[model samples]
Target chain A: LSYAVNIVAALAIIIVGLIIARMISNAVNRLMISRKIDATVADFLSALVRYGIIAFTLIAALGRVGVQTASVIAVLGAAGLAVGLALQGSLSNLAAGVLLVMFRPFRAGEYVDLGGVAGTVLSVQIFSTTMRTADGKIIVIPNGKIIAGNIINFSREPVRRNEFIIGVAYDSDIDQVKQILTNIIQSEDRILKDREMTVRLNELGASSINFVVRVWSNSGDLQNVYWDVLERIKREFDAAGISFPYPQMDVNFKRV
Target chain B: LSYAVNIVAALAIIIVGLIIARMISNAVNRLMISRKIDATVADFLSALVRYGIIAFTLIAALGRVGVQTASVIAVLGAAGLAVGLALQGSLSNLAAGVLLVMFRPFRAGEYVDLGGVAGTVLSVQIFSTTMRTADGKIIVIPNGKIIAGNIINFSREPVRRNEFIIGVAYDSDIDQVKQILTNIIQSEDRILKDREMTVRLNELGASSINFVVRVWSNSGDLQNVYWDVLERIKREFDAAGISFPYPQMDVNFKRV
Candidate 1:
């Protein structure tokens, strides 16, 4: 605060200008928040105006501090460069979008995860894809993002697979567990007989012996399969009085 | 032909300027194409320079043809605003990336469909998530795109469900077909005994009766389930001498 008059004047201008900028930006955001044509656009405009005013303010402050006239033009030129760069996003997004349409990675009504936006495709437009999620949420994303990454398509596949890890204590009868699993799996009519099924002692787990169960079924039927099989394991094992304790330990008395 | 000498000079600048811009842009794109540090950034920069030259060329032409000097300043302002707006994309994208990390919509190792990029996630960086496709293709996508739409988290769900439409001629014995479906569906041990199952005659087509077969199975087994059941239906129906002709026509002599 021991100020040279020019510096002090410039400092005041910056402080006041900054305050005004913030206030104006906030005001626009609040005002536009009501009608809501495009809040994002509104936000963008606010940022634009905020930065524009600040740039000019900076120019003015620099002038007040007696910088060369050429520097102001240079400042302006810098801003121009920045603006050109900013516009690049729009251009690139548009270019990317055209490519997306040309390639046809995913279609409307297809459930796809585009890059990272996962949803049911509702509509595809030149600029964006409107998506409807399972919880009834709607999302609008640019095709630039869509075409930029791996498109994991959930709808294309005819069916999906499930794997299970079931564990029982070491004291449990291994043969009985295997037999029970085999019987349960083989008896399930929905499990595809054509697909390979497996029930193997996969690991000596820390707390229990692990059995890996794998089977194929209708993709739509997967939830029911996980539930039914796990329930079957519990009920079947209970009936047979099997130890389902949640590992292995051995001890022998040693001479003292 | 541009008539006036000033217009002629401007015309030459426009022609030569455009050609040079295109050539330079093309050269930069080609030159940068090899290393592949960030090809997109290169493409973007080339486009920027191409447009920049053209803008100046247009400016020179306008001057040669005697436009007001003040208009030149206005043009520069327009460029500045555009730069600010473009820079907004960068700022917003960075903001979006930060928000993505804060919220934790999806994590590394999770198979997610973000926006439209679906893949097994390898790593989550500040700007992008690296993904590996089932086919072993790698993708990197921005969190800006990720947060913009539905984040379909395939990794979270325990199971997924399949629907089938099996058709046979209307002339075939409906009761017999129904009995056959029931027997086969029930006989398949993998089919969940406890869950609700349906075998319904959904539609009487122009030539055939459509039976909808619905059941549950391990998600992993869905493909096999579809193949096995359809095969069973065909083999059983074939042995029973059932007709699966494409649709129906009733020829009424009295009406004619």
Candidate 2:
């Protein structure tokens, strides 16, 4: 009769413990959300608390059933250590994810170049961050890698400078070329007139004189302005009877 | 009297355990070395075994001393878990280091391009690998990063291909230009005779005809051959009266 009573008590403890654990976990999640904590971190902490409470309850219930609860706790601890060692990478990634969310290097919907992968950040999770490329390919990069390398947040700035290397024939008048490029840049509505626009002879290449054209535009309209400038330059130059020089090699046939 | 006996027995157990653990650790290391296991992994495993035996001995000793070892063990396990969590990044790097040593992706003294950082590997350690750059910079990169990215082992192959894009005036005779470049590549003794050497007119560019010159050379002599070829080509071209074209634009000054 006493053994039966012990079993019943153990069952009662487990059921009550589980209900309380769930309630506390939910409360923690709600509190975090209300405090404006990052969603990923809030979710992770709530799950951690829920599991920790459940594990403690299980150990206590086993003790009520006359099991060696102390040894069981020890075994659980040792097992946790081994699992922790095995999943250390994942743990580091989780920490890194938390750091990323808190720091806000690049937020969701922001265009960022993380090391070499340029994409719009879709979401940040506990272990990995998802980004969508311009072509719509989804990339899941580990948070550890993201924090370890250089992160360029393109959308952080209001205006971005678009640069192009325009190659002109040596025979083309430099003054005329500069004027035409300036006219082309000014024609683009998206190009910021308030910012400085520069068109200068940058390099004397083996085949052509390179002019560097730098103009500022709204970050959102950078691509549009870039294409517009290139097309307008080609059309305007052609209409003005200016030709883009092809590579030329002069050879004198030596008497062999 | 019983308590005194327990203390003495515990002390004896600890002393014996320490001696045996040391012997076993040494034996395991020797056996691994004899079997040609990688030195790094051998050291790691021997250390792991030594510490594991010691931990077991300590736990046993505590049990014999009539101390509630279960709680003690639980405390130790919890401490280990905390430390493990804190050093998760280091632990991950250690695992990656083990993987690198076992797989032999790159060995000491080998030139490698790990993702983008190219250097000669100096040593592979438990947490990080050290590399010596060509300009005498010492770089210590975490094993985690090394294994996560693409590793290009430059020293794995005996020979490497060197390529150069030589530009000439567009008006230069195509056959003459090809002959000159071919002569230049063949003149260098470091250039491998057995491998295919190609000098072909690859592209008609805006300013020059691009001739792609590809030659095979000893990996060690790649830089030497590359510089030699360029110098010889420039000298020969000037002597042959073949002029390299500059960017030229045909401009008709429109009456403004």
Candidate 3:
């Protein structure tokens, strides 16, 4: 009869402890929400807090049941040490994932280049992130490597600059080529005027003079502007009596 | 004086245990090497065994020092449970990685679709696999997901069939179209005939008659055959009085 009473008391204590822990977790979650924290980090932090509280509650319940809690704690510590050593990589990933969410290195719908894969972020999860490549392929990358390497967020800014190099024969007029490029840029309705376009003779190649074409446009119009400008420049140059040079080989043989 | 003596004895026991553990680990590593096991797994297992022995030695030392070993074991057990919960994903990955090494689903240089990323296997690491896509993109995927998902090995077979759908005007003769398609296929040097080329009127659409073209070719030549065949068939059909239809709507003005 005494043992039965002890068991009931232990069960009651466990139930009460769980309820208290849940309340504390909910309170922490509400605090995070009030602070306007990122939903990803808030959710993860809340979960961790709740789990930690429940674990402590379990220990308290075990003590109330007349079980030797000290031994159990010792066994858990040793096992945790071994498992921690074994799972070093996973722990690193978890840590990195948290950092990614907190730091906001990149966000969903933003185009980013990380670990050599460039794509638009689809969703960022606790363990990994999903991306859609330019070719419309979906990719899931672990957050560990994403944090470990350099990240280039291409779509973070409202506007992006397109850079190109065009080569013309040395005899061709540079001023004419520049004018043609400038005309093409002005014709494109998508070009942004917030930033000035710059065209300069940047280099003299072995067979031709190369001019650098730089223009600023909204990120969304970058691809269309790039391809259309390239084609327009080529067509205009061809019509203006300017030649794009190709590598040439000249051989002369005389009988001795 | 007695406590000092016990300390010295414990130290001596730990030193001896370390030496024995190292020796056993070396032996195990050699055995695995003889079996031609993966270097990473071999290293991991050997280190695990060595560390496990050292842990045992530590426990024994504590016991000798008059510590309550039962209490310690209990604590360690609970910690281990928590750590296991945190590292469940990593453990699965490790297990799957080992399985992949044993079974050899796909090898380096073989194009495979693993977890929706299609690329040629670059290198297979212990925990993750690296692949290089056709467009020169590298991908690193966890071994666990690879094992969990469907893996399509494209290069496993010697030959692959190229399938294309070509649309023609509904009035074009099916027999004439088939003859032209057959001629185009024969003219293309890349198309293989061991498995017969199929050219059949397969479906009637709203604006055009869809014909299915199936041809067998070596995997290496599959892409080229697809491009060349489509172009050749289009040209042949056009020359032979077959019209390709485009969607159009006839409009009539009516007075209300």
Best-fitting candidate, measured by TM-score? 3
lDDT of 2 by residue, A110-213 (tens): 88777578898989988899999988899999988876664556676567778898877756776788888888887788988888677776654676667778
Docking class of 2: incorrect
lDDT of 3 by residue, B30-140 (tens): 898788787767888987788778767756764665435554345334544544654565566678778787777898899998777687787776556766654334555
Q: What interface RMSD, in Å and to 1 decimal, does model 2 have?
A: 12.4
TM-score of predicted model 1? 0.40
Ten residues in a row with the worst lDDT in model 2 chain B?
Answer: B132-141
Stretches of model 3 off by over 4 angstroms after superposition: A1-229, A233-256, B78-88, B250-253
Give the C-alpha interface root-mean-square deviation per candidate.
Answer: 25.7, 12.4, 20.8
Worst 10 residues of 2 chain A by lDDT: A247-256
Q: Rate the local accuracy (lDDT) of all candidates.
A: 0.67, 0.75, 0.71
Question: Model 2, range B177-249, lDDT digits (tens) per residue?
Answer: 8898888877789999889898898998876788898999998898667756664665477678887675555
Chain A accuracy as TM-score for every candidate: 0.57, 0.77, 0.76
The estimated TM-scores of all candidates read 0.40, 0.50, 0.57
Score residue B64 of candidate 2 by CA lDDT.
85
Second chain alone, TM-score for each candidate:
0.53, 0.80, 0.89
Fill in the DockQ of model 2. Answer: 0.05
Order of candidates by DockQ, top first? 2, 1, 3
**DockQ numbers for every candidate?**
0.03, 0.05, 0.02
